[PDB]
């Protein structure tokens, strides 16, 4: 019963300075609009101790499987080759990704029926906002 507010199929709603985060973690002009624009869906689901998030849009489809406190090598959209571990902190996922010396943090989170996502590197942050699809 790990993460079962977070299962399901959310659809992107708001989005609040993406394109300044994208620039410090170190993505280039033509990516950044792209990524920018997309309406990504993010799919969560769950089985056993292995969680999986799918993030499906016009852009790029990304898929993650893990488990909680254990790392794994990710590609990605931007196609960074990078060292992540996700883990549930306070009830928040928590997803650190570690490259080049650089370190970024993801966070999800249930809010009302939102799944509100914050992304920080050093002091930008952005916010994304999903609801239910």
């Not at 609040?16 to 985060?21: A, I, M, Q, V, W």
């Not at 993010?42 to 254990?70: A, C, H, P, Y």
Request: neutral net charge; contains cysteine.
């Amino acid at each position: 019963h790990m993460c079962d507010a977070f299962v399901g199929t959310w659809k992107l709603v708001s989005s609040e300075n993406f394109d300044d985060y994208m620039k410090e973690v170190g993505v280039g002009f033509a990516t950044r609009k792209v990524a920018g624009m997309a309406k990504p869906n993010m799919i969560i689901s769950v089985n056993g101790d292995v969680i999986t998030i799918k993030s499906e849009s016009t852009f790029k489809n990304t898929e993650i499987s893990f488990i909680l406190g254990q790392e794994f090598d990710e590609v990605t959209a931007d196609d960074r080759k990078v060292k992540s571990t996700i883990t549930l902190d306070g009830g928040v996922l928590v997803h650190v990704q570690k490259w080049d010396g650089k370190s970024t943090t993801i966070k999800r989170k249930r809010e009302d029926d939102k799944l509100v996502v914050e992304c920080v590197m050093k002091g930008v942050t952005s916010t994304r906002v999903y609801e239910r699809a």
